[PDB]
Design a protein around this nucleic acid. Structure first.
Lengths: 335, 335, 335, 335
DNA sequence: GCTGGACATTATATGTCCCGCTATGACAAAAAACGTCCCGT
DNA sequence: ACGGGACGTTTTTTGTCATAGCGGGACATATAATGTCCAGC
């Protein structure tokens, strides 16, 4: 099969280009259906008339249905996306790129989707799709999944679907949250979408450690913290440090600490410098950096060209993590 | 008859109002005939122009004769008035029931919808509808609305619609919540449904007072607590005490306190005995019982036959509150 | 309740008119959803702007949902149609009309829907709705339902829904059919819509009796004929004789017989004169006129002003049948 | 590889054609280099203008050198041609398989789709797709298409689309049917899907020949039978004999006849032995085996490994038929 | 014996715009309701 | 005293339409593919 694909790349690149453009149309319909030719052509970079030619082809092949409210995929369309998913990435050049990103960073594996999410918002949804598919490959019979609360993890929640294998799924918020995109919100949304269950907490924000210790000393609370300690999976974002610290209600004393110690990246309530060393921790009830070592599966979902530096810094140390990212970030990092 | 009227009010919301007004006109004519439009309007406190239109309508229906010396009933009018004497007490067993519930309980007003929500789940939605309509009549130009997190208040949130008058609406959670129906969830849902804004908090549960005091001492937190203190409206549920205490993670020491002091009702984090005296408070960051005095508008939404005793106990003291309830609770309380 | 309704008809006829117009909007949405204000206003006799006022009211009462593809009923809308169904007919004047139609014709009962299906095509769908509801009230634990193949029975099939009581339902074609609206087609469509089962036959048309007798003598065939003989219900149309005979491939000899014997009505393969006496039978394998006597439930579904004479003639003899018809036919017959 | 190619053909229907044509150009250059565009076009029977475009493309892909004295392969070209020698027999195991199936069976042509429909249900839909495309290539200006009623022909009907050339299409049922998948049902569904017209009949089943003769003697009936006799196309299935005879209501006398005469295959109401000789005919009004000779286009659609023996037996005699089948059947037959 | 260049014809894709559908708002105008208030009978 | 008439004001409903997105459709034009033919080196 690899021999066939390599021969096709030399003898039929003109045909491979048409196929990729038509495959991209099917992916964007899967994301946004039902959608009409005006909105879909605008969403891609192409004229209504060019799209209308391609969509009429796809309808004739019974891959899309065209109704008064727009276009949706047929069963054959959904099947085709699953069958061609991996080989299409070989010609998109993502395969070689993922190999190299894994040589460069401390990564268990790299999953890169097309595009730059800083330019093309829907790319966050494709990272979401990819992350969900990755989660499902790693689930055991029973699972406790800890999640953070940022907008990329929200995109993972939005793309979550029930598990075909019906494995047991309990979701909890490792980050606790700061303000509606708080880990509790995400945790619940992801569980509803997966037909799983979930457990919840309070918003930590920034407070005296003694106040957190009293919450930690509490029983019904302790039960949720022990569940978080037992997490089998962590799904988290990676942010720019300054962006995260200004978005939160960071005390002026801690802003100065964060700046003076040259923080560049943020993940699950910690700020790290360019060498991936912790420089500040926003105290929260729940997961600690030392706890990630014992979690079998960690999936970081983060992309966009603006995050290349943060992503590089975070993975300057081994994290035993699979990264789901996009070309925006990966190409900027690697060239 | 109750079922028919409840269906008819969906198409004709002030059906009972028109019925009652026309019935009163016919009663007053039977008492004073012949009487003219000037005397009849004055006696009923209706504008002459409105009364003149209604009696001209009744004359077209052959119920009243309009002659040189004024108005008298027809044969048809006397017969109809005799039929309405029987029906209309059954037609208006409600304005009668609400009048009596307000004589019995400490209530600013009573709003009672048909049915028993313990038997007929959709009755919770009609309490919701009624509560929303009540809220909108009480809004000022600017509003801070504090809400609790129980399933009946959830029903109020589900029926919330944007304000026709576009008054300013900020929602906050007075109860803070305990576990997905936490006041924060409700508060947000209600704000989205109203196209208002909202502010949020952490879940208190049961914890040491000192831990809460540290959260109270905090700044970005203090701002939300001060907003709650400035509430112009409170919308809250009323629960059975034992049900509420067992649903929560109540400490065994506090369960014994609650039982030993004969708590029967619960509202906004307080348990009260049969005389409406506080017997226990689940400590929470936010509203205190003493704070309700200063809130201009308080609406309690609670019904079902199982809550009759709790509702009676809660209103054994003046609360300056409008109660939205159902026949389930009201009829069980009053007979 | 009857006292309340009679008082409402005298005191509130202006309010009853508004309610009926809004109820008619809900009925036509149930039939055609999703539908938009341009198509729905045209379907009724009213301007887009008048409809838009009423539909905005219905949305505010949570009886309809308005989406990009048009309007549908909410749960509350479907419920309201079931609760008000019978009382709305009292003011539509259908109750008095049905009483009189049953005094005039040989009828077990009369069910009359509004309108004239000759003028307003959707009236055939409301006869369909009414017939289905009637069938479901008469089902026993086990049912064999024989059906004819005309366009009004097709409308019954289109409105068929699964039985809430999950009674056993087997459908068969009593008429056998003549040409795509053949009883076999209807029989199958009705069974699929009811989640029942069905058995089938060949199209008789017009042929020598001996050819039919050979088909009757056959075994796998005999089993279906015996099933038809065991029918617990018959659902059939009533047609004008000349229309039915010309639509079919009637032999010229039989056309002359039909004309010369003054046939005026047709039902299940028989032509009858003005006194309801058989004058000609299109020979078919299956049900015979003598067999209807032994069928517990017979429902005739037929309407439109053009059928008044045929309907009157058919019921000049006792048929122990419930007629589902429309005002078109009923008012023309009775005045 | 089979799965990848089948997916790729949905986006690029003549992928294998382009592949093969480019492979042949490279083979012919390796044999004759240096060779010019006039000689190479002549030798391959391709127009000089088309060949010139393909070799200019191959030169841009660095596979061929175009010099004053003509064209030679590059290093890359020799390597690619060596890879394609291995792949392309696996890439084109099909045009090879169809060639061989046509050497083995009595076939006008063979069309084989990937997979085994006994294992993979969707393979019946791809046979359907292929059969429709074949039908459309054979249509004349006016067409009478006779069809049988089995589940594979149903799959052909489901994939039917209107004719791009808008040729005239009338469909009729050659098989008449036995029980909802009766030829009449299929015939109608196919006509609706093609925007054609159709004519229909009764279900023959098994009956005395004299009863059929009376139906044959009839006029409006005779017109449909004469239309079937005028068929320009027949589209039929092929079944296992025992399966077909047990599915129908076969008389015990005829089952014994079918068994005792070693029937193995069934098509259009006839059972045949392993040598393709008729051993029993289920009498039906319509097409007879002798009639197929006069039909210009016959397309048999049948596949799955369980039908290999039936398919082989049916085509032991010349039928002037194009077979649409799958690898399931073809590979089992040929190895 | 070939390179590229090229001209006339035929086929396919594209641009443009189009009519007939669905939702939100939005301004103007007409009708209805109403608050007093006039007279004669 | 009481009803009919009525005028000015206020409130509510209606008419007209306005546009983005949804489709299948039509007409015109451009771009490309194709079928040969051109020269000299």
């Amino acid at each position: 099969m690899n021999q066939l694909i390599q021969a096709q790349k030399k003898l039929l690149p003109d045909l491979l280009l048409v196929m990729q453009k038509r495959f991209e149309i099917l992916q964007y319909i899967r994301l946004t259906e039902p959608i009409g030719r005006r909105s879909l052509s605008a969403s891609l970079g192409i004229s209504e008339r060019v799209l209308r030619g391609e969509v009429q082809f796809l309808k004739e092949q019974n891959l899309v249905d065209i109704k008064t409210n727009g276009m949706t995929l047929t069963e054959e369309g959904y099947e085709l996306l699953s069958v061609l998913e991996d080989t299409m990435k070989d010609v998109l050049g993502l395969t070689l790129l993922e190999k190299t990103l894994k040589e460069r960073l401390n990564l268990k594996d790299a999953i890169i989707v097309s595009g730059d999410s800083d330019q093309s918002p829907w790319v966050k949804k494709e990272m979401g799709r990819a992350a969900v598919a990755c989660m499902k490959k790693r689930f055991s019979g029973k699972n406790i999944v800890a999640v953070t609360g940022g907008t990329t993890i929200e995109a993972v929640a939005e793309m979550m679907t029930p598990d075909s294998k019906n494995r047991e799924l309990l979701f909890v918020p490792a980050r606790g949250g700061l303000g509606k995109n708080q880990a509790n919100t995400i945790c619940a949304h992801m569980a509803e979408k997966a037909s799983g269950t979930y457990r919840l907490l309070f918003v930590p924000g920034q407070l005296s450690q003694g106040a957190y210790s009293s919450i930690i000393e509490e029983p019904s609370v302790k039960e949720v913290l022990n569940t978080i300690k037992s997490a089998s999976m962590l799904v988290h974002g990676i942010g720019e440090a300054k962006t995260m610290a200004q978005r939160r209600n960071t005390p002026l004393e801690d802003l100065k600490k964060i700046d003076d110690n040259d923080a560049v990246t943020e993940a699950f309530g910690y700020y790290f410098n360019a060498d991936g060393e912790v420089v500040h921790k926003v105290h929260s009830v729940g997961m600690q950096l030392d706890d990630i070592d014992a979690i079998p599966d960690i999936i970081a979902v983060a992309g966009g060209s603006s995050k290349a530096e943060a992503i590089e810094a975070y993975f300057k140390k081994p994290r035993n993590t699979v990264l789901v990212t996009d070309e925006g970030a990966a190409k900027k990092l690697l060239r």
